[PDB]
Amino acid sequence: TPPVISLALPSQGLKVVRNTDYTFTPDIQHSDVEGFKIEWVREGKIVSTENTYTFNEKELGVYTVTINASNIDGTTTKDVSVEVVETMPYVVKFPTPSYLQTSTDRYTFADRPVFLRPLLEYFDNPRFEWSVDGQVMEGEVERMFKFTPSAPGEYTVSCTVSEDTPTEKISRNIDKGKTAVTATVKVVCVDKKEQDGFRASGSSKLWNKVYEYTPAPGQFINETSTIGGMTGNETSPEAAVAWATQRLKDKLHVSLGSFGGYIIVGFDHSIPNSGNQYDFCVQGNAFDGSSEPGIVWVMQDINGNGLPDDEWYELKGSEAGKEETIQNFEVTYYRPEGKKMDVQWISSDGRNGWVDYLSAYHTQDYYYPAWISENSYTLTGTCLAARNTQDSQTGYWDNQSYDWGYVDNFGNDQIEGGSTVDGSGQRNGFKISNAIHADGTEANLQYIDFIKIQCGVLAKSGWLGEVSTEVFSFEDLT
Ligand code: CNC
Ligand SMILES: [Ca+2]
Ligand SMILES: [Ca+2]
Ligand code: NA
């Protein structure tokens, strides 16, 4: 009397969700017999010898799972067809260096940590497991994993993000359980030493190239008056780069729009981490009451290809580490369904709001950038706590200052020269020594090759419109 396997399926077949645990608990008649063994076989190999087995697959398709049970009276076998047919919006992905870049590969020098951190969608209560080259890293259970290669080569890092989602009975023998989504990212430890990537020489102290101009929505985006300077031709990322390039050459404003908007520039040489007061400066238009702080991020061309596709490092400012500052904030903007409308956003803290359309001042059809093809996009960055406030007596708005560390901000790190009346010629100076790793520790960069300015507040001030960093120039001061 060998064993027989009972495993009830839905009458319509077993149609399951991707990235979701299904536990199979078959009834084994004559499990009492001496010499009882059970095996679970998938694509030839034995995946389990327990009485239950849990399935979870990422790819849609039909998977065959074979059960084999034995005792001293004979053997038996059963085949269950598991059809992965439904998706759910749970996503784990590693970030690229900018909106328009698609590679997730990461680059570092030997003995320099890389702080790996996935972006998540739909997760509310995530748990983390990390692996390097197939080996689970015991004790690494946090949203970031600090990985430090000690030798050149390529390393495959895997992160499984799980969430305790509600259990469901699928049949007498099948239970739907937790969600678990896996993503992988390649870390390249380059063969070079950091010092050997210093680009000496150089012909200009100014920025030499704009690589990308991806603002957030704002009243100066697609603004075609003489005040805005756009032409209507900025309908592609290449045209946006050409426009920003000419504006910066002429030291005319480039607005980043609302939170997260950014521009990426480089130089024809590396800017050293120097003993001067400042290593570089950025021209804003701040005056007292008109602070629209931009977060400064810097990048070394670790992989040597001339492109800003390596690691960004934040320059800490006066608000770094305060519990009210939000690292790794995300804002998603939506192109409105018609012309002359407010631009809606939702943020990663669960808030929602909009950038106001101001028909009195900026009369273009859209404040969402014309050259962002997609009808929604998500920008990340450090978000400072907003301090724009309206005086009720006068009704006037005060976009209040931060102490130091930010672009277009009337703080303590300004370089003499700008008008305190209208902000023309205003500059802030910056120190590469303020560069930090993602956990707040010192990055100790010897030099930088690229700068990204990221609008650092999500706010608006009535008839002033959104709080939006403007930049006008970039200069190596060493
Ligand atoms: C257009 C403009 C400007 N304005 Co008004 C005028 N006229 N502003 C306005 C309009 C902005 C509309 C919009 N775009 O959403 C408008 C009508 C709302 C306005 C209002 C005011 N402005 C006023 C003043 C005096 C000035 N503003 C000027 C900035 C003066 C500018 C003079 C100039 N630069 O030529 C100006 C001509 C050009 C600004 C600009 O487009 N910059 C380009 C943009 C890309 O940069 P930005 O950093 O984002 O500019 C922002 C700030 O300028 C802010 N803002 C504008 N005005 C002020 C004034 C103050 C005190 C503060 C703190 C912020 C502002 O709004 C702009 C858009 O967000 C000013 C330098 C002109 C001057 N007299 O020399 C002067 C401020 C001097 C100072 N205190 O340091 C008012 C007090 C006038 C009034 N009502 O009595 C009032 C105060 C606003 C407030 N704080 O609540
Ligand atoms: Ca590069
Ligand atoms: Ca602005
Ligand atoms: Na400004």
Numbering used by the authors: 115 to 592
Article excerpt on this structure:
The solved structure has three domains; two Ig-like N-terminal PKD domains (Ig-like 2 and 3 in the full-length protein) and a globular C-terminal domain. As expected from the successful structure solution via Co-SAD, clear electron density is visible for a vitamin B12 molecule bound in a cleft on the C-terminal domain, allowing unambiguous placement of the ligand. There are two main regions of interaction between B12 and BtuH2: the tetrapyrrole ring and the nucleotide loop. Residues Tyr510, Trp577, Trp511, and His476 form hydrogen bonds with the amide functional group of the substituents in C-7, C-8, and C-13 of the tetrapyrrole ring, whereas Asn399 and Gln333 mediate polar interactions with the phosphate and the -CH2OH functional group of the ribose, respectively. The interaction between the dimethylbenzimidazole (DMB) lower ligand and BtuH2 is likely weak, consisting only of van der Waals interactions with Leu578 and Phe401. The nucleotide loop interactions, including those mediated by Asn399 and Gln333, and the lack of strong interactions with the lower ligand, suggest that BtuH2 primarily interacts with vitamin B12 via its tetrapyrrole ring and nucleotide loop, which are conserved across cobamides. After inspection of the residues surrounding the electron density, in silico analyses of the geometry and coordination using METALizer and the CheckMyMetal server, and the analysis of anomalous signal peaks we modeled these as one sodium and two calcium atoms. The calcium ion located at the interface between the Ig-like domain 3 and the B12 binding domain is coordinated only with amino acids from the globular domain.
Human gut commensal Bacteroidetes rely on multiple transport systems to acquire vitamin B12 and related cobamides for fitness in the gut. Here, we report the function and structural characterization of one of these proteins, BtuH, which binds vitamin B12 directly via a C-terminal globular domain that has no known structural homologs. This protein is required for efficient B12 transport and competitive fitness in the gut, demonstrating that members of the heterogeneous suite of accessory proteins encoded in Bacteroides cobamide transport system loci can play key roles in vitamin acquisition. Our data indicate that BtuH2 is a membrane-associated lipoprotein that binds vitamin B12 directly, suggesting a role for BtuH2 in cobamide capture at the cell surface.
